[PDB]
Amino acid sequence: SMNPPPPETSNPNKPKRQTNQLQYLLRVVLKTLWKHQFAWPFQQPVDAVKLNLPDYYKIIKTPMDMGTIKKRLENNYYWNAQECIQDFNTMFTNCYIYNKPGDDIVLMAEALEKLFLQKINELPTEE
Numbered sequence: 001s002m003n004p005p006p007p008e009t010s011n012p013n014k015p016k017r018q019t020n021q022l023q024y025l026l027r028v029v030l031k032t033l034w035k036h037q038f039a040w041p042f043q044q045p046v047d048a049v050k051l052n053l054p055d056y057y058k059i060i061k062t063p064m065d066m067g068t069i070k071k072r073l074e075n076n077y078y079w080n081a082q083e084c085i086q087d088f089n090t091m092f093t094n095c096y097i098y099n100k101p102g103d104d105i106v107l108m109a110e111a112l113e114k115l116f117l118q119k120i121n122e123l124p125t126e127e
């Protein structure tokens with residue numbers, strides 16, 4: 001069994017910026033989700049070998065996880081906040097697509113997503 005290479009977290013080719021919104025995404029949004037009791041399954045790429053999920057990467061072709069997002073934010077990978085918001089949403093969507101409603105992992109994603117929406121609602125206007 002084999003995992004795919006993880007999503008990139010640096011690309012010197014890719015233009016990048018710091019914005020007030022990106023700083024909020026790290027200091028408030030990622031911080032908040034990372035420390036939550038339900039964060040752990042989402043803190044690194046899904047390890048389909050260890051978890052014995054050989055179909056995971058046959059189903060999920062756009063993987064994303066908070067370990068990747070954390071590294072992207074700490075490296076200033078992004079140009080804008082919407083790229084990073086999209087990453088979070090990809091992560092949640094992957095969980096909902098792969099798993100059944102009401103599975104514990106889905107409950108975990110839902111709790112994290114509730115907090116994500118709460119924080120995103122007060123994203124600052126750009127400086």
Ligand SMILES: O=C1CN(C(=O)c2cncc(-c3ccccc3)c2)c2ccccc2N1
Pocket residue numbers: 040041042046047051094095098099104105
């Ligand atoms: O989307 C996924 C990927 N996944 C995990 O990432 C994962 C990794 N660590 C822990 C959990 C987890 C935590 C509590 C309850 C059930 C699963 C899940 C997982 C593992 C096993 C069975 C189903 C899934 N579904």
Ligand code: NA
Pocket residue numbers: 096097098099100101
């Ligand atoms: Na599903």
